[PDB]
RNA sequence: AACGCGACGAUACUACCCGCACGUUGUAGACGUAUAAGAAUAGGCUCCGGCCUCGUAUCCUAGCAGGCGAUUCCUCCGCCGGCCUCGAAGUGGCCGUCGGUAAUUCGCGUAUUGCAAUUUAGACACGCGCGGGAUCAAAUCCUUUGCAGACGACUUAGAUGUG
RNA sequence: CAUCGGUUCUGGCGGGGGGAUAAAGGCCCAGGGAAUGUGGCUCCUCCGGGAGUGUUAUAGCCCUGGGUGUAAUACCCUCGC
């Protein structure tokens, strides 16, 4: 009975699923209200990733690949904070490519005119070596 | 019907020589503000007792805030609404975090499903279901199930309405 | 162009310099409503404030303007006064000495500014 | 040689006059600035000077190019369109033409 | 009401090999191979158990829940077709003029071709071309019987229906004139 | 928001009226718009309603002389889209006429638009607008059923264009792979101070 | 019906001013006429209204009946 | 379509073509007016390791509106020629010559437009020019015909002939 | 361009007052209770997980009272820059 099914695999909203809100902060689902809203708590030590406990609409949230394992339904802020520091949600979020893209975005928007000029100069300096390497690669093969 | 707040409105008949201490009547009224709350108090009191606004007074208006706005709760609302035929009962249930949010969801749902306005709906009882065995509507019973986890297929990405043209066809899988 | 502010004069006028050997802008007056203040700040240590005030005297620039205009009106360059040239060199020697310490700042001041595609002035930090 | 541009202004388009459904008022013009998409972004360019540059036939005082000067007064709507007032009302034929929003007078 | 989750199960025999990709079901069996495009129905396929295919709909209405039964029956019929096959036995009866049926296999098209002649003494020669995969034979065990066999139930039943509809009496009493070709038996080959 | 010299739009997967409204607003704002593959545009609702509407359109004709003044019914998908756009523009004025001269519509992707970037409008995309389970159709099928004669010619030209684009895609994959190896090779020769400065700046 | 291949004359939704004014006046005259026939109507009308009652699916209907019975006994004891 | 399009033949004349030589010449309106996979959206991309909300991206972007001389580099761009190639309204690839070229660093010049005044700068089309190369054509009126015709229009014929 | 006056649009900041002296909530203290029953135990098994038991265990939750507390914040009103 060889069954070869290749189908889509969505991320699921569940108790312990970590959401990323529009402001850049993180939350964890502690109880599901309906198919459009959840109850969430962001008890992170970092002020940027912190989110007050409350109702989160699922339209304004993004499903991160971080799920806190074995989190009880309706656990209060102390229990969610204990699970957060136990699982190390912050470190996994820093390893997540979404936060790397966000950090790159902040580094790009925090530039002054002198910074942009220096970026252009160092990018040309790097581009010289990349162009030489590409020319060598095309010449060899 | 708007950002609603629940008020206790306590009123009474004006004291006379026959009754130096008239009876006090307290009601729990959902209204956008205190003027509407007092108007609804006088309306419901005219519907039950020999008191009107010109012969009575408002002893107190207080705001009843939710004890636990951070706890997900099931609410059962028993209501009467007036249609072309007459007055009919409805029992409905809402999974919300406060009585006021349940009442706004109630008003939106009755407006959407039965074309009933604010002027034609009487909120008779709003109760909390202490146990999940008291839940009767299947659309709440599917939400109070054990280990409820579901995906969200076909999520249209939120793209800014001021950005007219995009160079990539968007995906609906995140 | 990118210049260095030396002193804020009265009624919105500013005293600026290039320096002259860096990008070609001499000692000059500008208006504060037509400049953008970049967050970088060149150290003024070694630049003499007495000569800065001497340039900031009210009739340092507007004097003899009718004289060069009448003298020049084959085309020929209007001659720069020896006082202007000497003050320009004396102010900008220490300024160039301070600029050369910071890396890429001399090239940054020699280069010109221009808006590119996607450059939004309401979101930039200067 | 240098391989860069020489632009120190923001591009804009002259959309229409201040109007209702039927009655138009040429004394005030509507301009869409490039990259400005809300009132918070338009607040930066309130007060800036905007020029409409066009080309005429007869050469007057060394050029065949004429400029109408004006400035941005207030935002219009919610989508970053701004209202502008010029020394003379802009031509009705220039609906859709390009205008230059300069960075002066500067508060930075 | 929008049901959060609804699911169906399809058991698969050991001989059957099922490959599903982008709602394109390919079923392989001892008798042959069938292919079907179910891209018009929003179904999520999965393997919930070894040898069981799971059909699911999330946040669907009652119609979307009910369509899973049609999908289940279609895939089950494909499995039954590639495992045992489908067979329609038809009988042609006549009153006075004997009906002549000749079955050939057009090789360039690779399909069977049934030729019907002398129906109510008519001089026209009716011709029905079969769907690919449908094999038509004249039964030697019984009298005036055609046998249509295949792996596709839709193809076999539609070919049998085409044979039944092409021989239809017109402008006559159907109480008196009883002639035609009729589907007698419907079943499996094995 | 960005002003461009010309905006080339892929008509595939787009809704006719929403794309027409957005294109007409851009045309009156002063932007040149070239829409290609108008046979792949979409109309919401299943095909019989669009066929009914076009036959009701075909019913309307002037009585005394059908060679003048009457509604001229165009069976091409490009000019169906052009009619949809022209209904949204004050075309009887000089401004509306000049706005319409900034628009070009085609069936398929004729050269040199085959070697140009084709953008999409997310406010009119059928997959992002219509609810799943709702029915739709294509403008090309309606055009073919009401009298368009060049469905097959445009089709064959499209497989030729797609084969040439596939060859271009293999070339672009090879170029991207060699660029990646060039970056990996140049990572060992560029100054670490420069690399650290660029990484800190966000590049 | 062969509507799709051969449509008929469309039914116009664009109402005319004559029709709008006439419909409004007939509606007002009908309202006055039904008010007159309501004042002249001899059909019996109950003063009391038949109350719909309490729904069966209300989970605390038993507790509400307990409360009503208890308040009835309290009022009878007070009286 | 008499304000839709294509192919072909011959093209006198300043008429045609090539180069630079510029416009009180015209343009619903240059200012980096940069960017080709297809396809699916209850699934895709890949270098096969993994990746996918995100074009908030990539390329390009420094110098008298961008000079001169070096130090230095073999990177980028452009004009020609050859070979291929591109028909949906036809154009790109490779090779070779030539010319330019901060990826690093330095010197000499910038002023005086006087505290802002469009940064007169691009493209296409047109005209006047010269300096060169190329070619020596038709249509109409008129006479005639009757396959035609109210009149125009149309089918013919008129240069040596089978007139 | 600077400094002003009249009218007006818009942004930010520093305070005060009120309500259940917000309601919550965090951290402690003292009780009580339940399941969409955690750990444990038992029985089935495709051994992937289900089923039963009971009140915290190798998760937690709910209700009541007290302390931090004249806590913060939301909302409304208000004094200014």
DSSP assigned state of F14 = B
Among candidates B70, E93, E49, F157, which has minimal Cα distance to A53? B70
- Look at the block and give the residue holding tokens 């158990």: E49
Task: Count the alpha carbons within 13 Å of C97 in the hemisphere toward its beta carbon.
Answer: 10
SS3 content of chain E, % helix, strand, coil (to 5): 20, 45, 35
Bridge partner residues of C15 (DSSP): C7, C29
Contact yes or no for C114 and D7 at CB 8 A: yes
8 A C-beta contact, residue D61 and residue D73: no
DSSP assigned state of C113 = P
Q: How far apart are CA A48 and CA A23, in angstroms?
A: 9
Token representation of residue C109: 């001041």
Burial, A102: exposed, middle or buried (Cβ in 10 Å; 0-12, 13-18, 19+)? middle
Q: How far apart are CA C55 and CA B28, in angstroms?
A: 80
Token representation of residue E122: 């008519």
Token representation of residue C111: 């280069």
- Look at the block and give the residue holding tokens 């075909």: F58
The backbone torsions φ and ψ at residue B100, rounded to the nearest 5 degrees and listed phi first, read -65, -40
Contacts of C102 (CB under 8 A, 6+ apart): C42
Q: How far apart are CA C105 and CA C122, in angstroms?
A: 25
Q: How far apart are CA F139 and CA E10, in angstroms?
A: 39
* Three-state DSSP string of B153-168: CCCCCCCCCCCCCECC
8 A C-beta contact, residue A41 and residue A27: yes
Give Cα B79 distance to the centre of its chain: 10
Whether chain D lies against chain C with 3 or more Cβ pairs closer than 8 A is yes
- F interface with B, Cβ–Cβ < 8 A, is 1, 7, 9, 13, 22, 26, 117, 119-123, 125, 127-128, 132
Number of H helices, E strands in chain F: 8, 5
Rg (C-alpha) for chain F, rounded Å, is: 23
Task: Count the alpha carbons within 13 Å of A45 in the hemisphere toward its beta carbon.
Answer: 9
Q: How far apart are CA E131 and CA E30, in angstroms?
A: 20
Q: How far apart are CA F13 and CA F11, in angstroms?
A: 6
DSSP string, chain E: --EEEEEEEEE--SS-EEEEETTEEEEE-SS-EEEEE-TTS--EEEEEETTEEEEEEEEE-HHHHHHHHHHHHHHHHHHHHHHT-EEEEEEEE-SSSPPEEEEEEETTTTEEEEEEE-STT----EEEEPPTT-EEEE-SSSSSEEEEEES-HHHHHHHHHHHHHHS---SS-TTT---EEEEEEEE---
Bridge partner residues of D68 (DSSP): D52
Contact yes or no for B165 and F9 at CB 8 A: yes
Q: How far apart are CA B77 and CA B67, in angstroms?
A: 18
Q: How far apart are CA C42 and CA C22, in angstroms?
A: 14
F37: left (phi over 0), alpha (psi -120 to 50) or beta: left
Min Cα distance D35 → chain B (Å) is 10
Q: How far apart are CA E180 and CA E168, in angstroms?
A: 7
Among candidates B93, B68, B65, which has minimal Cα distance to B78? B93
Find the discontinuities in chain A where C to next N exceeds 2.5 angstroms and give the residue preceding each: none
Among candidates F195, C57, F101, B76, which has minimal Cα distance to G58? B76
- Look at the block and give the residue holding tokens 């999965």: E46
Q: What is the dihedral of CA A16, A20, A26, A32, to 10 degrees?
A: -40
DSSP string, A40-96: EEE--SSTTT-EEEEEEEGGGEEEEEEE-SS--TT--HHHHHHHHHHHTHHHHHHHS
Burial, C25: exposed, middle or buried (Cβ in 10 Å; 0-12, 13-18, 19+)? middle
Q: Best mutation site among E1, E9, E20, E23 for testing chain A: the one with the most A CBs within 10 Å?
A: E20
* Three-state DSSP string of B74-130: EEEEEEEEECCCCEEEEEEEEEECCHHHHHHHHHHHHHHHHCCCHHHEEEEEEEECC
Q: What 3-state class would DSSP assign to F87?
A: coil
Write out residues 101-160 of B within 8 Å (CB-CB) of E: 138-139, 142-143, 148, 150-153
8 A C-beta contact, residue F179 and residue A133: no
Burial, E154: exposed, middle or buried (Cβ in 10 Å; 0-12, 13-18, 19+)? middle
Bridge partner residues of D98 (DSSP): D13
Among candidates E92, E121, E117, which has minimal Cα distance to E102? E117
Q: Best mutation site among B127, B137, B140 for testing chain G: the one with the most G CBs within 10 Å?
A: B127
Token representation of residue E190: 């094995």
Whether chain G lies against chain A with 3 or more Cβ pairs closer than 8 A is no
- Which of E1, E42, E59 shows the shortest C-beta gap to B138? E1
> Contacts of residue F59 in chain G, CB cutoff 8 Å?
7
Write out residues 87-106 of B within 8 Å (CB-CB) of G: 87-91
Determination method here? cryo-EM
- Look at the block and give the residue holding tokens 């085609």: F106
| CB contact burial A13-37 (16+ within 10 A = b; e otherwise) | bbbbbbbbbeeebbbbbbbbbbbeb
Q: What 3-state class would DSSP assign to F142?
A: helix
B32 touches strand I (CB under 7 A): no
> How many other CB atoms are found less than 10 A from the CB of residue E28?
16
Neighbours of chain A (3+ CB pairs under 8 A): B, C, E, F
Number of H helices, E strands in chain B: 3, 7
A65 touches strand I (CB under 7 A): no
Q: What 3-state class would DSSP assign to C29?
A: strand
8 A C-beta contact, residue F83 and residue F74: yes
Sign of the C-alpha dihedral, residues F93, F95, F101, F103? negative
8 A C-beta contact, residue C23 and residue C1: yes
Among candidates B141, E3, E91, C20, which has minimal Cα distance to G59? B141
Stated length of chain G = 79
Among candidates G23, F137, C103, C35, which has minimal Cα distance to D107? C35
Pairing outcome for strands D98-102 and D49-60: antiparallel
Token representation of residue B130: 């202490």
A79 touches strand I (CB under 7 A): yes
Contacts of B117 (CB under 8 A, 6+ apart): B111
Residue of F nearest to A116 (CA): F201
Give Cα F55 distance to the centre of its chain: 25
Token representation of residue F185: 């090779």
> Contacts of residue B76 in chain G, CB cutoff 8 Å?
58-60
Q: How far apart are CA G58 and CA G64, in angstroms?
A: 10
8 A C-beta contact, residue B3 and residue B58: no
Contact yes or no for F30 and D37 at CB 8 A: no
Within 7 Å of a protein beta carbon, the nucleotides of strand H are 24-44, 46-47, 51-67, 74-76, 86-92, 100-106, 108-121
The backbone torsions φ and ψ at residue G3, rounded to the nearest 5 degrees and listed phi first, read -75, -40
Q: How far apart are CA D47 and CA F115, in angstroms?
A: 43
Contact yes or no for C37 and D36 at CB 8 A: no
DSSP string, chain G: --TTTS----------HHHHHHHHHHHHHHHHHHHHHHHS------SS-------TT-TTHHHHHHHHHHHHHHHHHH-
Pairing outcome for strands E33-37 and B5-13: unpaired
> Contacts of residue F2 in chain D, CB cutoff 8 Å?
34-35
Q: How far apart are CA A54 and CA A41, in angstroms?
A: 7
Token representation of residue D98: 């390009």
Whether residue C19 has a cis bond before it, omega within 30° of 0: yes
Q: How far apart are CA C71 and CA C76, in angstroms?
A: 11
- Which of B87, B125, B136 shows the shortest C-beta gap to G52? B87
Q: What 3-state class would DSSP assign to F11?
A: coil
Min Cα distance A104 → chain F (Å) is 5
Among candidates A108, F125, E51, which has minimal Cα distance to C120? A108
Asked if C65 has any chain D CB less than 8 Å from its own CB, the reply is no
- Which of B88, B129, B134 shows the shortest C-beta gap to G52? B88
Q: What 3-state class would DSSP assign to A30?
A: strand
Residue of E nearest to A1 (CA): E14
Q: How far apart are CA F108 and CA F86, in angstroms?
A: 21
- Look at the block and give the residue holding tokens 């049998």: E160
DSSP string, D10-43: EEEEEEEEEE-SS-EEEEEEEEEETT--SHHHHH
A85 touches strand I (CB under 7 A): no
Burial, E43: exposed, middle or buried (Cβ in 10 Å; 0-12, 13-18, 19+)? buried
Token representation of residue B88: 């009919």
Q: How far apart are CA B117 and CA D57, in angstroms?
A: 67
- Look at the block and give the residue holding tokens 């002249």: G40
Q: How far apart are CA A18 and CA A41, in angstroms?
A: 9
Among candidates F122, F127, D41, which has minimal Cα distance to B159? F122
Element of type H or E holding E56: strand E52-60
* Three-state DSSP string of F162-178: HHHHHHHHHHHHHHHHH
CA of D108 to C1' of H52 (A): 40
Q: How far apart are CA E136 and CA E156, in angstroms?
A: 10
Token representation of residue F54: 């076009």
Contact yes or no for F186 and A126 at CB 8 A: yes
Q: How far apart are CA F7 and CA F30, in angstroms?
A: 11
CA of F28 to C1' of I7 (A): 37
Bridge partner residues of D33 (DSSP): D12
8 A C-beta contact, residue D90 and residue D14: yes
Asked if F180 has any chain A CB less than 8 Å from its own CB, the reply is no
Q: How far apart are CA C34 and CA C30, in angstroms?
A: 8
Stated length of chain D = 108
| CB contact burial G23-42 (16+ within 10 A = b; e otherwise) | eeeeeeeeeeeeeeeeeeee
Task: Count the alpha carbons within 13 Å of B29 in the hemisphere toward its beta carbon.
Answer: 27
> How far is the CA of F61 from the CAs of F49, F55, F70, G4, in angstroms?
21, 12, 5, 18
Number of H helices, E strands in chain E: 2, 13
Burial, B77: exposed, middle or buried (Cβ in 10 Å; 0-12, 13-18, 19+)? buried
- Which of G4, G6, G10 shows the shortest C-beta gap to F48? G4
Whether residue F112 has a cis bond before it, omega within 30° of 0: yes
CA of C108 to C1' of H61 (A): 14
Within 7 Å of a protein beta carbon, the nucleotides of strand I are 1-2, 9-11, 19-20, 22-27, 34-37, 46, 48, 50, 59-64
Neighbours of chain B (3+ CB pairs under 8 A): A, D, E, F, G
Pairing outcome for strands F33-36 and F7-10: parallel
Q: How far apart are CA A116 and CA C123, in angstroms?
A: 14
- Look at the block and give the residue holding tokens 């000029």: A117
State this model's resolution in angstroms.
Answer: 2.9
8 A C-beta contact, residue D83 and residue D76: yes
Among candidates F190, C42, F192, C108, which has minimal Cα distance to A121? C108
Contact yes or no for E18 and A7 at CB 8 A: no
Q: How far apart are CA B93 and CA B106, in angstroms?
A: 9
Give Cα F151 distance to the centre of its chain: 17
Helix axis angle, F151-186 relative to F139-146, nearest 10°? 160
| CB contact burial F138-148 (16+ within 10 A = b; e otherwise) | bbbbbbbebeb
């Amino acid at each position: 009975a060889e069954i070869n099914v290749e189908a889509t695999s969505w991320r699921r909203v569940e108790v312990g699923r970590v959401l990323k809100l529009e402001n850049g902060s993180l939350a964890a689902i502690v109880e599901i209200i309906d198919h459009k809203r959840v109850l969430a708590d962001g008890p992170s030590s970092d002020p940027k990733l912190a989110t007050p406990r409350g109702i989160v609409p699922l339209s304004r949230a993004l499903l991160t690949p971080i799920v806190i394992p074995k989190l009880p339904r309706g656990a209060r802020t102390g229990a969610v904070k204990k699970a957060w520091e136990a699982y190390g949600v912050d470190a996994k979020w820093k390893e997540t490519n979404w936060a790397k893209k966000q950090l790159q975005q902040e580094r790009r928007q925090s530039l002054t005119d002198f910074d942009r000029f220096k970026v252009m100069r160092l990018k040309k300096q790097r581009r010289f070596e990349e162009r030489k390497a590409l020319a060598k690669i095309k010449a060899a093969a | 019907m708007g950002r609603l707040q629940e008020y206790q409105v306590i009123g009474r008949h004006l004291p006379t020589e026959a009754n130096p201490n008239p009876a006090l009547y307290r009601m729990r009224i959902f209204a956008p503000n205190e003027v509407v709350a007092k108007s609804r108090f006088w309306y419901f009191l005219r519907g039950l007792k020999k008191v009107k606004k010109a012969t009575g007074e408002i002893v107190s208006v207080n705001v009843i805030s939710e004890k636990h706005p951070l706890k997900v709760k099931n609410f059962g609302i028993w209501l009467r609404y007036d249609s072309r035929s007459g007055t009919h009962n409805m029992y409905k249930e809402y999974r919300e975090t406060s009585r006021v949010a349940a009442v706004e969801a109630m008003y939106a749902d009755m407006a959407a499903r039965h074309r009933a306005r604010f002027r034609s709906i009487h909120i008779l009882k709003v109760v909390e279901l202490e146990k999940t065995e008291d839940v009767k509507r299947p659309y709440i019973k599917q939400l109070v199930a054990k280990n409820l986890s579901f995906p969200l297929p076909h999520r249209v990405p939120k793209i800014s309405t001021k950005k007219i043209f995009s160079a990539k066809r968007p995906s609906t899988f995140s | 162009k990118r210049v260095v502010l030396l002193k804020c004069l009265d009624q919105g006028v500013l005293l600026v310099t290039g320096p002259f050997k860096i990008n070609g802008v001499p000692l000059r007056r500008v208006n504060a409503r037509y400049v953008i203040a970049t967050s970088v700040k060149v150290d003024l240590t070694g630049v003499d404030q007495a000569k800065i005030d001497e340039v900031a005297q009210p009739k340092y620039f507007t004097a003899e303007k009718a004289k060069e205009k009448a003298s020049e009106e084959k085309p020929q360059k209007k001659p720069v006064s020896s006082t202007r040239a000497a003050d320009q060199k004396a102010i900008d020697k220490a300024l160039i000495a301070n600029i050369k310490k910071v890396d890429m700042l001399a090239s940054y001041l020699a280069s010109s500014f221009s808006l590119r595609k996607g450059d939004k002035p309401h979101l930039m930090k200067f | 040689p240098s391989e860069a541009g020489h632009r120190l202004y923001v591009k804009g388009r002259h959309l229409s006059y201040q109007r209702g459904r039927r009655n138009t008022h040429p004394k005030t013009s509507l301009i869409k600035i490039e990259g400005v998409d809300d009132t918070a972004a338009a607040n930066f360019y309130l007060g800036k000077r905007v020029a409409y540059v066009y080309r005429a036939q007869k050469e007057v005082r060394g050029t065949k190019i004429r400029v109408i000067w004006g400035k941005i007064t207030r935002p219009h709507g919610n989508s970053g369109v701004v209202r502008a007032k010029f020394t003379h009302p802009l031509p009705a034929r220039s609906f859709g033409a390009s205008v230059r929003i300069m960075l002066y007078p500067s508060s930075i | 009401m929008r049901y959060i989750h609804s699911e169906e199960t399809i058991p698969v025999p050991e001989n059957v090999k099922v490959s599903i990709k982008s709602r394109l079901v390919t079923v392989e069996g001892p008798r042959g191979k069938l292919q079907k495009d179910l891209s018009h129905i929003a179904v999520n396929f999965s393997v919930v158990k070894k040898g069981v295919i799971g059909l699911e709909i999330h946040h669907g209405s009652r119609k979307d829940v009910a369509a899973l039964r049609t999908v289940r029956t279609i895939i089950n019929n494909m499995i039954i077709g590639v495992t045992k096959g489908f067979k329609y036995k038809m009988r042609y009866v006549y009153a006075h003029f004997p009906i002549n049926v000749n079955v050939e296999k057009n090789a360039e098209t690779g399909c069977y071709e049934v030729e019907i002649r002398n129906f109510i003494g008519e001089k026209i020669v009716r011709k029905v071309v079969m769907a690919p995969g449908v094999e038509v034979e004249i039964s030697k065990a019984q009298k005036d019987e055609l046998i249509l066999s295949g792996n596709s139930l839709e193809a076999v039943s539609q070919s049998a229906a085409d044979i039944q509809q092409i021989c239809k009496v017109r402008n006559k009493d159907i109480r008196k004139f009883l002639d035609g070709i009729y589907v007698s038996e419907k079943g499996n080959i094995v | 928001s960005s002003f461009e010299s010309v905006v080339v739009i892929d008509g595939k997967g787009h809704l006719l009226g929403r794309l027409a409204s957005i294109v007409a607003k851009q045309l009156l704002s002063g932007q040149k718009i070239v829409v290609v593959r108008c046979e792949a545009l979409n109309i919401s609702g299943e095909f019989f309603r669009a066929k009914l509407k076009y036959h009701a359109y075909l019913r309307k004709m002037t009585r005394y002389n059908p060679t003048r003044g009457g509604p001229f019914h165009f069976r091409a998908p490009s000019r169906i889209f052009y009619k949809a756009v022209r209904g949204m523009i004050p075309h009887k004025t000089a401004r509306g006429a000049a706005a319409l001269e900034r628009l070009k519509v085609f069936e398929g992707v004729p050269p040199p638009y085959d070697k140009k970037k084709k953008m999409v409008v997310p406010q009119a995309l059928r997959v992002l607008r219509l609810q799943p389970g709702r029915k739709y159709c294509t403008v090309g099928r309606l055009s073919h059923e009401v009298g368009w004669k060049y469905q097959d010619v445009v089709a064959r030209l499209e497989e030729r264009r797609k084969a040439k684009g596939a060859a271009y895609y293999e070339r672009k994959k090879l170029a991207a792979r060699q660029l990646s190896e060039a970056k990996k090779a140049a990572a060992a020769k560029v100054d670490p101070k420069v690399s650290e400065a660029l990484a800190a700046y966000g590049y | 019906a062969g509507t799709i291949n051969k449509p008929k004359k469309p039914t116009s939704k664009r109402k005319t001013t004559r029709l709008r004014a006439k419909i409004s006046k007939r509606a007002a005259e009908k309202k006055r006429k039904e008010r007159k026939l309501a004042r002249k109507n001899p059909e019996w009308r109950s003063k009391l209204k038949k109350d719909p009652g309490i729904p069966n699916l209300f989970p605390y209907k038993e507790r509400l009946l307990q409360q009503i019975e208890e308040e009835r006994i309290r009022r009878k004891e007070e009286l």
